[PDB]
Amino acid sequence: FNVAHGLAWSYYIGYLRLILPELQARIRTYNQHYNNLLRGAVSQRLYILLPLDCGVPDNLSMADPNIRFLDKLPQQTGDRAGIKDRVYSNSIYELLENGQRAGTCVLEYATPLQTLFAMSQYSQAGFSREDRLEQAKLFCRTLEDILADAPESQNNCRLIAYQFSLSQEVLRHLRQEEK
């Protein structure tokens, strides 16, 4: 529990709190040159995939061929713990449905889940494969409780937890926001 609790707090403090206040302007800036009457604009929140039991690939097209990379948002830099101009980059994806674009959003996995699942290769990391499955659930619940007590971050991101069409799962959450 304390392994998942710590990773959720680390992710909020060292990542979501730094990028979510600036996310809206970065998206709005991308939508300036990009948005027109012939296409859907990039949606306004960070969609964070929280798979409960997945290998967590680096390429979202590997998870679902209906999720394709479109472009990067303009970068966000800042000095952090001795590192000058540490870079925070986010990617824009199209969500296809029946061969046509149905959604456009900034999407990514919660990186601590990928790292958690990779701890299995190391004997000294401890915890069996069944322990890692409960730590993913505990990471998600903790993060959800954090965002519930942080109204600013709450409206700038959407958690997509799940256990298959990943495109349809993201599209479902994306469609709840508009209508």
Ligand X SMILES: Nc1ncnc2c1ncn2[C@@H]1O[C@@H]2CO[P@@](=O)(S)O[C@@H]3[C@H](O)[C@@H](CO[P@@](=O)(S)O[C@H]2[C@H]1O)O[C@H]3n1cnc2c(N)ncnc21
Using CB under 5 A, list all residues that contact Ca ion. 41
Q: What span, in angstroms and rounded, lies between the C-alpha atoms of 68 and 93?
A: 5
Cα–Cα distance for residue pair 47/61, rounded to 1 Å: 16
Shortest Å distance, C-beta 102 to Ca ion: 14
User: 129-148 and 111-118 helices cross at what angle (nearest 10)?
Assistant: 160
The answer to the question of residue 37 lying near Na ion (CB under 5 A) is no
Check: CB of residue 14 under 8 Å from CB of residue 7.
no
Residue 23's binding partner among Na ion, Ca ion, ligand X, none (Cβ under 5 to 8 angstroms by kind) is Na ion
76 binds Na ion (CB under 5 A): yes
111 annotated as a binding-site residue: yes
- Copy the structure tokens of residue 54: 């997945």
By CB under 5 A, name the one of 50, 67, 105, 147 that touches Na ion. Answer: 105
Q: Which residues bind ligand X (CB under 6 A)?
A: 10-11, 14-15, 83, 86, 88, 111-112, 115
- Residue with Cβ nearer Na ion (142 or 153): 153
Contacted entry of Na ion, Ca ion, ligand X, none for residue 132, CB cut-off 5 to 8 Å set by kind: none
We find the least distance from the C-beta atom of residue 83 to ligand X, in angstroms, to be 6
Annotated binding residue at 89?
Answer: yes
Q: Which residues of 86-124 are buried (b: 16+ CB within 10 A; e: fewer)?
A: eebebebbbbbeeeeebbbbbbebbebbeebbeeeeeee
Residue 60 binds to Na ion (criterion: CB under 5 A): no
Q: For the chain, give me the number of helices (H) and strands (E)?
A: 7, 7
- Please list every residue from 119 through 178 that binds Na ion, using CB under 5 A: none
d(CA 117, CA 51): 11
Among 31, 35, 91, 154, which residue interacts with Na ion (rule: CB under 5 A)? 91
